C-alpha cells in the first residue's frame, strides 16, 4: 500500500513531517497525492490535495511535498487540536485509488488537568426492575489515563465493573465512565458506594447511599 | 453540495450490506466521480469503488472487487454499495465522498466533500433496545439520563428537545461483557431552575425503534 509511519509523537509549538511511501504507479506517476485528518466523530478532513495545495478553510500551518515516490506532510506550530490520525491517498493507474495505513500523532506538554467526577445511584424504576445501576462519570481530565476503585461499605467492589477507556472531549481534555451493576437487593444491603478515580497519583472520590 | 449515508446499522454475517448515499447541491450525472469509503473503528480508511457520474463506469478495490457492487440512480440523485457475503472484518463506518479532480491523467483525482458516515456492524447478535433511565440530581446541579443495554450502536441524546446545548455532556458507550452498550448524558444546569424549568432528554436507538423522551426530577 501506501506506507506511514504508525506512530509520531512532538511536543507543542514544534513542526512534524509525516512521510507516505507508494510507487511510480501512484505517487510518483501523478502529482495528485491528497492528505486526510481524521478525529474520532467527524468524516475524514481533507487537509492537501495535488501534493501541495490547501483547500479554503485549511490552516497555514499544513503543507504538502513529494520526492520520487514518496510524499511528505508537515505541520508546524503543533497544536492539541492536531492529534489525530493522518492519512496519505492517491489515485492509482490506471483505476483505483489506495490510502496509506495512516499516522497516529501525539502532541506532548499539554497542561496537566485533574478529573472531575459525578456518580449518581440507581433511578426508582431501575430498582423496580431488581436492578441497579451506578453511574460514575469522570470528565476534564489530562493525560488521559485514570485508575478506578469502587467500594461499598469502604471495602474493594471488584465484580460487576466496567469501565471505558477515555477519549477526547471538544476541550481536548478526556472522559471516561464507569458502571457499577448490581441487584437492588445489593444496593440496599449496604449504607454507601464510592466511585474513587485516581489520575496522575492524585484521587478523587464521591459517595452515594441508598 | 452534500452527501448523506443511509442503510442498516446491523447485518447478520454471510448476508448482504447494502447502502445508498443521497446527494444534494449537485447533480450526480456531472463529471464527478462518486466514492465509497470505510474506516472499522480502530483502524486504518480504505477506499471500496467509485462510479464516473458522467458514463457511470466502476472501478472497485481490487481486494473486494468480487465483493462489490456500486449503482446510481440519476433521478433521486442517489448512487449505492452493495457488499456481499460480509463478516465482521467489514464492520465499519461506511463514508460516500465527491471525488474531484483538474485533469486526472495529471493529477488523479481527491475527496473534497464527504457524508457524515454510516457505522455498520456485522454481528449475528439480536437488536435489543435500551432502558431509559432518569439520573435525578449547591447552586449547581447535575442530572441526566442512563440508556442501558442497547444493541447495536449509536444511540442519540438531545435534552428539551435540541433547545438545550450548553453544559450538556453524553459519554462515549461502555461495552459490557454481556455484548451490549450503556450510555450516559449529563446537564449541569442551575439549582434555581429545578422545580421551574423542566429537563427531558430525548433518547433514539432506531435499531429497536426505542424512541424516548423521559422527564427528569429531583427524588421525591
Known amino acids: 500500500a501506501l506506507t506511514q509511519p504508525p506512530s509520531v509523537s512532538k511536543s507543542l509549538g514544534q513542526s512534524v513531517t509525516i512521510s507516505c511511501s507508494g510507487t511510480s504507479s501512484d505517487i510518483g506517476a501523478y502529482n495528485g497525492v491528497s492528505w486526510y485528518q481524521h478525529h474520532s466523530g467527524t468524516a475524514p478532513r481533507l487537509l492537501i490535495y495535488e501534493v501541495s495545495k490547501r483547500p479554503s478553510g485549511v490552516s497555514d500551518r499544513f503543507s504538502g511535498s513529494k520526492s520520487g515516490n514518496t510524499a511528505s506532510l508537515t505541520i508546524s506550530g503543533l497544536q492539541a487540536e492536531d492529534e489525530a490520525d493522518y492519512y496519505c491517498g492517491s489515485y492509482r493507474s490506471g483505476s483505483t485509488w489506495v490510502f496509506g495505513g495512516g499516522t497516529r500523532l501525539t502532541v506532548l506538554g499539554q497542561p496537566k488537568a485533574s478529573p472531575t467526577v459525578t456518580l449518581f445511584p440507581p433511578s426508582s424504576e431501575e430498582l423496580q426492575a431488581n436492578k441497579a445501576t451506578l453511574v460514575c462519570l469522570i470528565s476534564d481530565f489530562y493525560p488521559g489515563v485514570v485508575k478506578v476503585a469502587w467500594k461499598a461499605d469502604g471495602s474493594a467492589v471488584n465484580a460487576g465493573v466496567e469501565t471505558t477507556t477515555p477519549s477526547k472531549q471538544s476541550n481536548n481534555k478526556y472522559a471516561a465512565s464507569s458502571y457499577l451493576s448490581l441487584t437492588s437487593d445489593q444496593w440496599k444491603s449496604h449504607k454507601s458506594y464510592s466511585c474513587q478515580v485516581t489520575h496522575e497519583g492524585s484521587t478523587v472520590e464521591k459517595t452515594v447511599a441508598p | 453540495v452534500q452527501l448523506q449515508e443511509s442503510g442498516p446499522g446491523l447485518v447478520k454475517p454471510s448476508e448482504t450490506l447494502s447502502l445508498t448515499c443521497a446527494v444534494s447541491?449537485?447533480?450526480?450525472?456531472?463529471?464527478?466521480?462518486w466514492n465509497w469509503i470505510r474506516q472499522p473503528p480502530g483502524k486504518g480508511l480504505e477506499w471500496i469503488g467509485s462510479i464516473y457520474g458522467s458514463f457511470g463506469g466502476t472501478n472497485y478495490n481490487p481486494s473486494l472487487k468480487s465483493r462489490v457492487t456500486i449503482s446510481m440512480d440519476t433521478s433521486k440523485n442517489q448512487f449505492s454499495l452493495n457488499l456481499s457475503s460480509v463478516t465482521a472484518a467489514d464492520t465499519a463506518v461506511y463514508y460516500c465522498?465527491?471525488?474531484?479532480?483538474?485533469?486526472?491523467?495529471?493529477?488523479?483525482?481527491?475527496?473534497?466533500?464527504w457524508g457524515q458516515g454510516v457505522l455498520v456492524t456485522v454481528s449475528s447478535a439480536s437488536t435489543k433496545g435500551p432502558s431509559v433511565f432518569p439520573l435525578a440530581p449547591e447552586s449547581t446541579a447535575a442530572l441526566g439520563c442512563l440508556v442501558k443495554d442497547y444493541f447495536p450502536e449509536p444511540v442519540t441524546v438531545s435534552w428539551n428537545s435540541g433547545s438545550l446545548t450548553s453544559g450538556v455532556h453524553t459519554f462515549p458507550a461502555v461495552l459490557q461483557s454481556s455484548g451490549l452498550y450503556s450510555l450516559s448524558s449529563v446537564v449541569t444546569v442551575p439549582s434555581s431552575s429545578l422545580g421551574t424549568q423542566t429537563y427531558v432528554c430525548n433518547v433514539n436507538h432506531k435499531p429497536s425503534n426505542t424512541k424516548v423522551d423521559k422527564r427528569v426530577e429531583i427524588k421525591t
Open positions: 447541491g449537485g447533480s450526480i450525472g456531472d463529471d464527478y466521480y
Open positions: 465522498a465527491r471525488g474531484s479532480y483538474n485533469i486526472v491523467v495529471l493529477f488523479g483525482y481527491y475527496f473534497d466533500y
